[PDB]
């Protein structure tokens, strides 16, 4: 058949002046490149077959060789950046774009897949795929009244390729391309397929990771309520990118954060802040830290949703990275919060875990914790209860920690620790 061909036999078949022999050789190459173990990509490249595959992409009178060459090139473009670059150097991008409009659904799907791989290589190839005009036909493939009439795999492939066109930074995708893609991406974000939903959320997360103008571009399309709904999903592959997008959005202005809060996102954070997946807990605590860096009414919404005890919990027990995010959240809370809010924070039991974390071997967390202690002490000064707080910090073994920190290597650390010991102890 066409299984277990040698690269030499494939070369002899492709070099023949017989389109059908070329078809069989290209199919053998595809099967070689579809092997689960060590596909001979570099050997196929060294044989100089990529230009022949690219030429075959244009054989409209022989759709099987189009499909087989597209498959082979897709699998070559799936490897190292040098291999994808070899695919691009053979002129594959315009041929695949021209193939997007093929009347055969499987060929158009393979073209979508190949372009997805090429664009996913990096921002340069992504912008080159965009410059060749792939977005218009890609979106025309999804221009239907109901996405449910399209094949599941077809739709998943289109969504993943679009996500790759939204991915990567330095630079971020062209603004016009993002505006062109966003409407279709929102429609996909409202689709009922978990993989389509996950990849659409990943795309939204890419688009919201950057300057606040990108966040505004995304938020103006009204995706925040759907992002919150997906944040409440049961499938981790959906919650992860939804949480990423929500966090990114709350990295922006106070009004974007407020749009997140108004959609009811905080009501989901009791679960997120106790999620068994360490990454979910970490990113949820990072989101909470960015929310506590907001306005005082937003800190008050954090309080009203009963989330301060959950921050105390993650500060008490969690992965160290999550504990650092929690310390950041506490410091932002104390920096922006009212006196009543800081008192409430103390009443929930923050002092003991905050102190226990001062024994960490990470300078930054120690700094952050000391700024939080200074802010809480300022609130105490305003209420005239600095000695009460000093007693609370001593009884739990915190004074020992600060006195030991006085001899820390970092300069800011010992400065802050000494200042506390001199002002309050």
């Amino acid at each position: 058949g066409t299984v277990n061909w040698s690269v030499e036999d494939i070369v002899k078949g492709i070099n023949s002046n017989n389109l059908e022999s070329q078809l069989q050789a290209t199919q053998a190459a595809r099967k070689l490149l579809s092997r689960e173990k060590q596909p001979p990509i570099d050997n196929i490249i060294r044989a100089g077959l990529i230009p022949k595959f690219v030429s075959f992409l244009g054989k409209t009178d022989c759709s099987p060789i189009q499909f087989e060459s597209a498959w082979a090139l897709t699998n070559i473009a799936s490897g190292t950046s040098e291999q994808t670059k070899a695919v691009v150097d053979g002129g594959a991008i315009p041929a695949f774009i021209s193939l997007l409009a093929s009347p055969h659904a499987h060929i158009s799907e393979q073209a979508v897949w190949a372009l997805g791989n090429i664009a996913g290589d990096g921002s340069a190839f992504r912008d080159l795929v965009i410059k060749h005009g792939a977005i218009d036909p890609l979106l025309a493939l999804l221009a239907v009244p109901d996405l449910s009439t399209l094949a599941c795999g077809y739709l998943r492939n289109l969504t993943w390729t679009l996500s790759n066109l939204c991915r990567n930074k330095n630079p971020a995708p062209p603004l016009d391309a993002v505006e062109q893609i966003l409407p279709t991406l929102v429609r996909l974000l409202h689709h009922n397929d978990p993989e389509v939903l996950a990849d659409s959320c990943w795309a939204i997360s890419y688009l919201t990771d950057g300057p606040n103008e990108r966040i505004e571009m995304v938020v103006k399309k009204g995706v925040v309520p759907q992002l919150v709904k997906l944040l409440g999903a049961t499938e981790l592959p959906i919650v992860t990118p939804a949480l990423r997008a929500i966090g990114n959005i709350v990295t922006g202005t106070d009004e974007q954060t407020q749009k997140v809060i108004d959609a009811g996102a905080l009501a989901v954070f009791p679960s997120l802040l106790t999620n068994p997946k360490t990454n979910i807990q970490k990113e949820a605590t990072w989101t909470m830290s960015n929310i506590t860096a907001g306005r005082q009414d937003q800190i008050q919404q954090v309080v009203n949703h009963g989330l301060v005890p959950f921050l105390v919990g993650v500060l008490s027990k969690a992965d160290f990275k999550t504990q650092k995010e929690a310390a950041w959240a506490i410091t932002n809370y104390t920096s922006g919060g009212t006196v009543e809010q800081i008192v409430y924070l103390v009443h929930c039991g923050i002092i003991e875990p905050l102190m226990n974390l001062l024994s960490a071997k990470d300078t930054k967390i120690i700094q952050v914790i000391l700024d939080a202690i200074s802010n809480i002490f300022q609130a105490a000064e305003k209420l005239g209860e600095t000695e009460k707080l000093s007693i609370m910090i001593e009884e739990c073994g915190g004074l020992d920690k600060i006195e030991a920190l006085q001899r820390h290597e970092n300069e800011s650390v010992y400065k802050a620790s000494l200042n506390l010991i001199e002002k309050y102890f």
């Binding site: 990771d209 950057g210 990423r244 966090g247 990114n248 709350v250 990295t251 922006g252 990072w286 830290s289 960015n290 860096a293 950041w328 932002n332 920096s335 922006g336």
Partner: peptide, 6 residues
């Protein structure tokens, strides 16, 4: 100001 991007 105190916001920390990803």
């Amino acid at each position: 100001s105190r916001k920390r991007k990803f």
